[PDB]
Paper text:
We previously developed two hetero-bivalent nanobodies (Nbs), aRBD-2-5 and aRBD-2-7, with potent neutralization activity against the wild-type (WT) Wuhan isolated [name]-[name]-2, by fusing aRBD-2 with aRBD-5 and aRBD-7, respectively. To investigate the mechanism by which aRBD-2, aRBD-5, and aRBD-7 neutralize WT [name]-[name]-2, we determined the crystal structures of aRBD-2-7 in complex with WT [name]-[name]-2 [name]-tr2 (tandem repeat [name]-dimer) and aRBD-5 in complex with monomeric WT [name]-[name]-2 [name] at 3.2 Å and 1.8 Å, respectively. Structural superposition indicates that aRBD-2 would not clash with aRBD-5, despite their sharing F456, N487 and Y489 of [name] as contact residues. aRBD-2 would not clash with aRBD-7 either, while aRBD-5 and aRBD-7 compete with each other. Structural superposition supports that the three Nbs would sterically interfere with the binding of ACE2 to [name]. Taken together, aRBD-2 retains the binding activities to all tested RBDs of major [name]-[name]-2 variants, and its hetero-bivalent constructs by fusing with aRBD-5 or aRBD-7 displayed increased affinities, even though aRBD-5 or aRBD-7 alone is partially ineffective.
According to the structures, aRBD-2 recognizes an epitope close to the lateral loop of the receptor-binding motif (RBM), which partially overlaps with the epitope of the angiotensin converting enzyme 2 (ACE2). The binding of aRBD-2 with [name] buries a 639.1 Å2 surface area. Residues D420, Y421, F456, R457, N460, Y473, Q474, A475, N487, and Y489 of [name] participate in the interaction with aRBD-2. aRBD-5 and aRBD-7 bind to overlapping epitopes on the concave surface anchored by the β-hairpin of the RBM, and bury 697.9 and 669.3 Å2 surface area, respectively. Ten (L452, F456, E484, F486, N487, Y489, F490, L492, Q493, and S494) and six (Y449, G482, E484, F490, Q493, and S494) residues of [name] are involved in the interaction with aRBD-5 and aRBD-7, respectively. Due to the steric clashes with the adjacent [name], aRBD-2 cannot bind to the “down” [name]. However, aRBD-2 and aRBD-7 in aRBD-2-7 can neither simultaneously bind to one single [name] (the distance is 64.3 Å), nor to two adjacent “up” RBDs (the distance is 80.8 Å). The only binding mode that allows simultaneous binding of the spike by aRBD-2 and aRBD-7 in aRBD-2-7 is that aRBD-2 binds to an “up” [name], while aRBD-7 binds to the adjacent “down” [name] (the distance is 47.4 Å), which would lock the “down” [name] in the closed state. However, aRBD-2 is unique in that all of its binding residues in [name] are conserved in the Omicron variant, while for those conventional antibodies, there are at least two binding residues mutated in the Omicron variant, explaining why except for the BD-629 and BD-515 that have not yet been validated, the other nine of them have been experimentally confirmed to be ineffective or have greatly reduced neutralizing activities against the Omicron variant.
Author numbering:
A (entry chain A): 333 to 529, 553 to 748
B (entry chain B), C (entry chain C): 1 to 118, 134 to 261
C-alpha cells in the first residue's frame, strides 16, 4: 500500500515538550488526509498556501511533521506572523509558511490529579528564535549586568518552566497536542539562470573588501537575477572550482531555485574540508556541507590582501565543541568550553577554555598555512521529484 | 531599525502624578523604562513583554507600565512622586525578557526630563590612595573598535620589581581569568557601549600597592596561558598609581 | 551506532609494558581511554582527535596514544607500569574535543583487566561524625528515573528546630542554588549515569550538626524561590545524621 506513517506521529503515547519540539520526516509514501481528518476529533485543522479540500490531489517535494504540547490559548501562536511566549521563544513558523497546523485537546491523555509538570516551555531568552529554530539550552538566564557564575538567585534564573495540567482546569489552560505539517510545493519558479529563461551581485560577494571568519560564516541569498557563470570562471585565478551534484561546464544552461552564497576564510590545507563527506577541525566544528550537496565550492589564495607584517589574527576558527555541527549550521557562541566534570562558572583556567582561536597569517608563511577566501554556492535543482502524494495523485 | 519617541515629561509638585508616553515605529517586542540622574548611571525602572510586567522593587506600587496595542505606544504612570524621582527618563526596546539592564535593549528614545520639587589609545583612570581593607575601581577607556579579538589584560608593577599579570577579560566574549594573588578580591568587566574596561579591586592590602596598567592583546588564543605574559600585548595605557596605607 | 572491541591486557611485573587496541566498526571522531580501579571512579587516561593528543598530566610520558591508518584502530602504549596502574581500561568514542570526563563520550568498549605485581525511592548515605574544620560528602540515589525535571534539594533538622532548606541542584540542568547559612561551603553536584545527587559539606562547624534529608521536586519553576519551601517537594529520603565535634 505504502501509506504515510501518521500513526507514529499523531497516535504516539509520548509527546514532546514544545521547547524541545520533535520533528519527523515524511517521504516516499501516500497520505490520505481525509482519513486523517476523520481519524480524530480535531479542534484546529487549518492550512496555509494550499487548500485543505484539495489536499488529496497534491504532491510535495519535502514534508516534515513537527510535534509538541502547548496550552489551549497558545494554539493561536502556531500560525505565521504571530507572537507570544511560544512563537517568540519556543516554536516559530516563517512568514512564507506552506503547510497545515493540526491540534486537538489532550486533557484525557496529558493530565493527572496532582498535576502533570513534565511538559515544559522556555520562558526567558536573549532574543527571538529564527523560523524553525530549536533551543534545548538549559543555561542560567542573566537578567542584569553581573554574570551568574553557575548559581541561581536574584537576576539569575532557570530559563525553562513547566505547564501545570490539572483535570479541573479551564479549557484555555488545558493541554493540546499539535502537529505541524510543512510542505514544499512541487512546481517551483526558477529564481536564477544563465543565458536561458539584471545581473547577479557576484562582484559584491567575491570582491567584498571584508570577508568573515569561518565560525561566523556569511550567507547572502542570490535571487531574481542572471548568473554570469561563464565570466566568473577565469574572472580571477582560482585554486579551486570543484562542483557537486551538477556538471561544471553546464552552469549557464542550467536553471535553479533558492540560491545561496556562503563566504569565509580558512587555511590552505583546510580547503580540502569544504566538500561533502569530509571531516576535520573545520568540517566538524565550523562549516559542514551535507553528503547530498548540490553546488559549487570556489576558493582563491589571498596572501596579498589578508596577511600583514605582524599578522592577521582577526580570522578566527572554533577549536573545541561538545558535538559536531549539523549540515549548514552556524555556531557563534563564546561560552567557556567545559573540558572536565566540574562546572566553569564564567572563569577560564584548567579544563575551562575559550572555544575560538585566531588563524595566524604572517606573509612569510608557507602555502599550507596561508589565507584562502572561499565562496560556496548552494543550489536547489529545478523540477525535483515528488516525495509525498495523496491517493488521487 | 525601530525609532522611539518619548513625551509627557515636565515639572510636578511632590505627592503628584505624571504620565510618560513612548511611540514606536513598529515591531516593538520587549519595551522598558530607565531613568538617569545628572552625572549618575542609568537605572532600570520597569518593563513589559507579552502582557507580563517587571518593575524595580523600590518603585513597584507607585509606577504602572501599560501598552496601547492599536497605537503601537506604551505609557508609564508615575504616582506619589518625590525628589528622588528627578531624572531624565528613557524608553527602550529589545528582544530579551527579564531585561533589567542597558545591554538587554537595542533601541533607545531621546529622553524626556522630569523634575519634582517638595592607532589604538588606552586611557586609564580611577587610581589613588586608599586605606587598607578599602576598595578601588580602575577604568581603561579605548578610543577605537578596529580589533574586536583577544582580551584586555591588567598588569601591576610593584616598587622595585618587574611587571606581573593581574587579571583579564575577553573582548570576544564575557569570560575572565585572574592571577592567584588577586583571585576572589579583584574582578574585571567591560561595557561594550562605552568601549571601556573596568577592574574592581576589593580588600586591598599594602602588597597591592603598585602601578597598574591596562593593555589589549589583539590575538585570540583558546587557552589563557599566553595572556599571562606581557610580550603578547600590543597596546598599553599610561598607567595609574594605586597606594594602600599600612 | 559504533562498536568498540578492545585488544590486549593481562598480568605484568612492575617496570613492564603493555599495548591495548580499539577496533571501531564505524567512523569515530574523538577516541579515548579510561581506567577504573576496584570500587573507584573512572579516571581519564588519554584521548585523540584529528592527530591532536591529550593526556592526563599524571600519566603523561609513560602513556602514549597512536592510530594506524590501515586498520583505523588506535593503540595505547603503557610504559613503566607500577601497581598504581592496575585497573580495567576502557575504549571510548564521542564527538566532543577536549573530552576529559566520562560524560563527553557516547560509546564504550567492553574492558580489559590490567594487573601489576609490586513510588520514587531515595536512599541517602555518607553521614557521620566529623572533626570541626572537616568535610563530609552526602550522596542520594534515586531508583525510578520517571521524573527527569525539577530539582533535587537538601534540608536539615537541627536539635529543637524545624526542617530548613540548605541547597539544591537542577535535575534538568547543572545550575545550583544555596541557603546563606552554607554559601561558600556546601556544593551541590549530580551524576546522570548513576541518577545520584551529591552534597559536599566543607568547613563544618558544630552548628551544622543535624539530620540531613534529600528530596525531589518534580515541578520545574524558573524562579527557585519555591524550592526553599518544604511543601514543594514530592519525595523524601530517610534522613542521615551529621554530627560535628567541637
Ligand atoms: C490513530 O489511531 C486511531 C485509533 O486507533 C485511528 O482511528 C481509527 O479508530 C478506528 C475505530 O477505533 C480503528 O478502526 C482504527 O484504529 C482507526 N481507523 C481505522 C478504522 O483503521 C487513527 O486512524 C490513527 N491515526 C493515524 C492515521 O495514525
Ligand atoms: C572582481 O575584480 C576584478 C578585478 O578588478 C574585476 O575585473 C571583476 O569585474 C570583479 N568581479 C568579479 C565578479 O569577478
Amino acid at each position: 500500500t505504502n501509506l504515510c506513517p501518521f500513526g507514529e506521529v499523531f497516535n504516539a503515547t509520548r509527546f514532546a515538550s514544545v521547547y524541545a519540539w520533535n520533528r519527523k520526516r515524511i517521504s516516499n509514501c501516500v497520505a490520505d488526509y481525509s482519513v486523517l481528518y476523520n481519524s480524530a476529533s480535531f479542534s484546529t485543522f487549518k492550512c496555509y498556501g494550499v487548500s485543505p479540500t484539495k489536499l488529496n490531489d497534491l504532491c510535495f517535494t519535502n514534508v516534515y511533521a513537527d510535534s509538541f504540547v502547548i496550552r489551549g490559548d497558545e494554539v493561536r501562536q502556531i500560525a505565521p506572523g504571530q507572537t507570544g511566549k511560544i512563537a517568540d521563544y519556543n516554536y516559530k513558523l516563517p512568514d512564507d509558511f506552506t503547510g497545515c497546523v493540526i491540534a486537538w485537546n489532550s486533557n484525557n491523555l496529558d493530565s493527572k490529579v496532582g498535576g502533570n509538570y513534565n511538559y515544559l516551555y522556555r520562558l526567558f531568552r536573549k532574543s527571538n528564535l529564527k523560523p524553525f529554530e530549536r533551543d534545548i539550552s538549559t543555561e542560567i538566564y542573566q537578567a542584569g549586568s553581573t554574570p551568574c557564575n553557575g548559581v541561581e538567585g536574584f537576576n539569575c534564573y532557570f530559563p525553562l518552566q513547566s505547564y501545570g495540567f490539572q483535570p479541573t482546569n479551564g479549557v484555555g489552560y488545558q493541554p493540546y497536542r499539535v502537529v505541524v505539517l510543512s510542505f514544499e510545493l512541487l512546481h517551483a519558479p526558477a529564481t536564477v539562470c544563465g543565458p536561458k529563461k539584471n545581473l547577479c551581485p557576484f562582484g559584491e560577494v567575491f570582491n567584498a573588501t571584508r570577508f568573515a571568519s569561518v565560525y561566523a560564516w556569511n550567507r547572502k541569498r542570490i535571487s531574481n537575477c542572471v548568473a554570469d557563470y561563464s565570466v566568473l570562471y577565469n574572472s580571477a585565478s582560482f585554486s579551486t572550482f570543484k562542483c557537486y551534484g551538477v556538471s561544471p561546464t553546464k552552469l549557464n544552461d542550467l536553471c535553479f531555485t533558492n540560491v545561496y552564497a556562503d563566504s569565509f576564510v580558512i587555511r590552505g590545507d583546510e580547503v580540502r574540508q569544504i566538500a561533502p563527506g569530509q571531516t576535520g577541525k573545520i568540517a566538524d566544528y565550523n562549516y559542514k556541507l551535507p553528503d547530498d550537496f548540490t553546488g559549487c565550492v570556489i576558493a582563491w589564495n589571498s596572501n596579498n590582501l589578508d596577511s600583514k607584517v605582524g599578522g592577521n589574527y582577526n580570522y578566527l576558527y572554533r577549536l573545541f565543541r561538545k558535538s559536531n555541527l549539523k549540515p549548514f549550521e552556524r555556531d557563534i557562541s563564546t561560552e567557556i568550553y567545559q573540558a572536565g566534570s566540574t562546572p566553569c562558572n564564567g572563569v577560564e583556567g584548567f579544563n575551562c577554555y575559550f572555544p575560538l582561536q585566531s588563524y595566524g597569517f604572517q606573509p612569510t608563511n608557507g602555502v599550507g598555512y596561508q589565507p584562502y577566501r572561499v565562496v560556496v554556492l548552494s543550489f536547489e535543482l529545478l523540477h525535483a521529484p515528488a516525495t509525498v502524494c495523496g491517493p488521487k495523485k | 531599525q525601530v525609532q522611539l519617541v518619548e513625551s509627557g515629561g515636565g515639572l510636578v509638585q511632590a505627592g503628584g502624578s505624571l504620565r510618560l508616553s513612548c511611540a514606536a515605529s513598529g515591531r516593538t517586542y520587549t519595551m522598558g523604562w530607565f531613568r538617569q540622574a545628572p552625572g549618575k548611571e542609568r537605572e532600570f525602572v520597569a518593563a513589559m513583554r507579552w502582557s507580563d510586567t517587571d518593575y524595580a522593587d523600590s518603585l513597584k506600587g507607585r509606577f504602572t507600565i501599560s501598552r496601547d496595542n492599536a497605537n503601537n505606544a506604551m505609557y508609564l504612570q508615575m504616582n506619589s512622586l518625590g525628589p528622588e524621582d528627578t531624572a531624565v527618563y528613557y524608553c527602550a526596546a529589545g528582544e530579551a525578557w527579564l531585561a533589567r539592564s542597558t545591554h538587554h535593549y537595542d533601541y533607545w528614545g531621546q529622553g524626556t526630563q522630569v523634575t519634582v520639587s517638595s592607532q589604538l589609545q588606552l586611557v586609564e583612570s580611577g587610581g589613588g590612595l586608599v586605606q587598607a581593607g578599602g576598595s578601588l575601581r580602575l577604568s581603561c577607556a579605548a578610543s577605537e573598535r578596529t580589533f574586536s579579538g583577544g582580551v584586555m589584560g591588567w598588569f601591576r608593577q610593584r616598587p622595585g620589581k618587574e611587571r606581573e599579570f593581574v587579571a583579564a577579560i575577553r573582548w570576544n566574549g564575557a569570560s575572565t581569568f585572574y592571577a592567584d594573588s588577586v583571585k576572589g578580591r579583584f574582578t574585571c568587566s567591560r561595557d561594550n557601549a562605552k568601549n571601556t574596561g573596568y577592574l574592581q579591586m576589593n580588600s586591598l592590602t599594602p602588597e597591592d600597592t603598585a602601578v597598574y596598567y591596562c593593555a589589549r592583546a589583539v590575538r585570540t588564543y583558546a587557552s589563557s596561558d599566553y595572556y599571562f605574559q606581557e610580550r603578547t600585548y600590543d597596546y598599553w595605557g599610561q598607567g595609574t598609581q594605586v597606594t594602600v596605607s599600612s
